[PDB]
């Protein structure tokens, strides 16, 4: 796991291969605190959250498409690790309206 978590720390920052040390040790600590989740597995339930979310952001067409893509996905190869993958994409889901304020002026504080 160490070579993989690390490479994530280098890529995300897009720079630094030991200048990302702070972020690595931090990632390791965070992962080292034991989270427990609200619902573990079931393909249908995670898929549904993504469908409702689609409708809610006014990207109804795309929501329609996502269902085709979901079925397709199983046929290119079956996943045992899907709930977790589909969750990660869920938590990173955004709305097409509005910006999150400035976060390039927030550094100066």
């Amino acid at each position: 796991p160490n070579v993989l978590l690390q490479n994530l720390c280098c890529r995300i920052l897009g720079k630094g291969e030991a200048d990302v040390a702070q972020q690595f040790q931090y990632a390791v600590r965070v992962i080292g605190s034991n989270f427990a989740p609200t619902v573990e597995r079931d393909e249908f339930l995670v898929t549904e959250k993504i469908k409702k979310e689609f409708v809610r952001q006014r990207r109804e067409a795309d929501g329609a498409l996502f269902s085709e893509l979901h079925r397709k996905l199983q046929s290119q190869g079956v996943l045992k690790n899907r709930w977790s993958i589909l969750y990660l994409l869920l938590s990173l889901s955004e709305d097409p309206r509005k910006q999150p304020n400035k976060t390039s002026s927030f550094a100066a504080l």
């Binding site: 993989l4 890529r11 931090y26 893509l69 290119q76 994409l89 390039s104």
Partner: protein
Amino acid sequence: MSAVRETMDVLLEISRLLNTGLDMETLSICVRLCEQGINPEALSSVIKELRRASDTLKA
């Protein structure tokens, strides 16, 4: 390895529609992490914290 190439083209469609904002190389790291086993809560939590951190460091 043939298999590995097909899955990523469909996966990249969901992520770009849903707004996620991960390039190809990084999207491969998470799939590795999830296969070796990770709590899902931790994985989302780091990605969000690294992103917030990165934008401030740059600016």
